[PDB]
Each structure stands twice: as C-alpha cells, then as structure tokens.
Design a protein around this ligand. Structure first.
Ligand code: SF4
Ligand code: SF4
Lengths: 71, 150
C-alpha cells in the first residue's frame, strides 16, 4: 500500500507522492521578537522631581494665598 | 533465512482477509504472532484478495475458510489422529478450499481439537463463538472429569 492511499493520478513512480502536510509557508514566518523591549520613555529623574518640587513651591504659595483669603 | 521468512509471511498475509478484529482467535494466532515477530512490517499486495465461502462443519467448528492459509494441518489431523477422513484440500492453486466436499458435519468426536491444531482463526469453536478474547481468559491448569481418561 502507501501508493493507494496517496494517489496523485499519474506520477509514474512511488516517489512524487502528494505529501501535503502542515509547515511554515515558503520563506518562513516573520522575524519574531523575543527580547525585552520595555520603553523607558517616561519622565526622567528630573522633570519628575522638578514637577513635584515646582508644585510644593507654587502650590504651597497658593495654599498661603488661600490662607490669606480665608483669614 | 530471515528474508525467506519475510517472503513467505507476505504470501500468507497476501490473499488472507483482514478478519483479525472479527477473528475469534485474534490474540492467540500463529499468523499474527509470526507476522509481528518474523514477517515484514508492511505488505505490498494491493489487489483483490481471494475469498472463500464458509463451509458448514457442524455445531462445534465455526469455519471461515477465507482466513484459512491452506497449510493442510487440519486435513492431516482428521485423516490421521481423528482418523475419520472427512476434511479435504479440494481444488488447486489459490482456489484451494479446506473442508468436506459435500456438506458433512464432522461426525467424529476428537475433531474439536482441529481449532487448537489450526494455526489460523478459520477453524474456531462455534460454542466459544466470540464470547471472549485470548487475553481476557485467566487460565487454570485443571483436569477433566467427563470421561475416565482424565
Ligand atoms: S488468523 Fe485471524 S487473527 Fe490471525 S492473522 Fe488471520 S485473520 Fe488475523
Ligand atoms: S488447519 Fe486451519 S489454516 Fe491450516 S489448512 Fe486447516 S483450516 Fe486452513
């Protein structure tokens, strides 16, 4: 058998049997990423301290002015 | 020697029907255990196997002569040990058919042992029609008490 299970009309020979099974497409798949691409594009060490400290300087001035208005 | 054995076990399994699942002697088979041990793993015969009608050999020996390989063991057992001379190898070639040429129940006692003689399911106990399998049966080496031969 095995030439009556995989017919492929013609083929003249036991080789050239159909042989259609699963696999990667011709040319493989896309290059798959595996590294750790963690983007560190956030606020830096400064700009975070200077945003906080700018607030505990202007916002505290505003607390002061609000205390003046309340008084 | 091994190539000769594989050759012959291919011929035997060539015109032999795929009756192993429905064969009563499926597990306890010389043909299955010689093919799975000395015969080739594959068969190149992809054509029309020969088939043979089932002879009526009585209420003891269920007969499926298509499975039978025409090794002649039973037709010798009935002629010699059983001594009744009813079985025969009728015909020649692949058309060879083992059994009585006229419908003739094996009137001889001692002719139920042809099933153990038979290396193939073909001749099987009709009482033990299909009720069990060669692996389920737990065997005890008992004796017999029907007749005083023990
Ligand atoms: S005798 Fe029965 S079990 Fe053994 S190979 Fe033939 S069909 Fe299969
Ligand atoms: S013993 Fe069984 S296999 Fe051998 S010739 Fe007789 S019926 Fe056929």
């Amino acid at each position: 058998t095995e030439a009556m299970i995989r017919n492929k009309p013609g083929m003249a020979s036991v080789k050239d049997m159909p042989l259609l099974q699963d696999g990667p497409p011709p040319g493989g798949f896309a290059p798959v990423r595996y590294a750790r691409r963690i983007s560190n594009t956030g606020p830096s060490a400064m700009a975070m301290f200077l945003a906080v400290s700018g607030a505990f300087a202007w916002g505290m001035y505003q607390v002061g002015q609000g205390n003046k208005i309340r008084r | 020697a091994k190539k000769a054995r594989e050759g012959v076990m291919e011929f035997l399994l060539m015109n032999h029907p795929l009756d192993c699942p429905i064969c009563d002697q499926g597990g306890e088979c010389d043909l299955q255990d010689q093919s799975m041990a000395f015969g080739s793993d594959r068969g190149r015969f992809t054509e029309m196997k020969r088939s043979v009608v089932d002879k009526n050999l009585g209420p003891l020996v269920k007969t499926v002569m298509t499975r039978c390989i025409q090794c002649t063991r039973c037709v010798r057992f009935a002629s010699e040990v059983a001594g009744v001379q009813d079985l025969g190898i009728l015909g020649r070639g692949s058309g060879e058919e083992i059994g009585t040429y006229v419908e003739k129940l094996m009137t001889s006692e001692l002719s139920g042992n042809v099933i153990d003689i038979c290396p193939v399911g073909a001749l099987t106990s009709k009482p033990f029609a299909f009720k069990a399998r060669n692996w389920e049966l737990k065997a005890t080496e008992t004796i017999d008490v029907s007749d005083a031969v023990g």
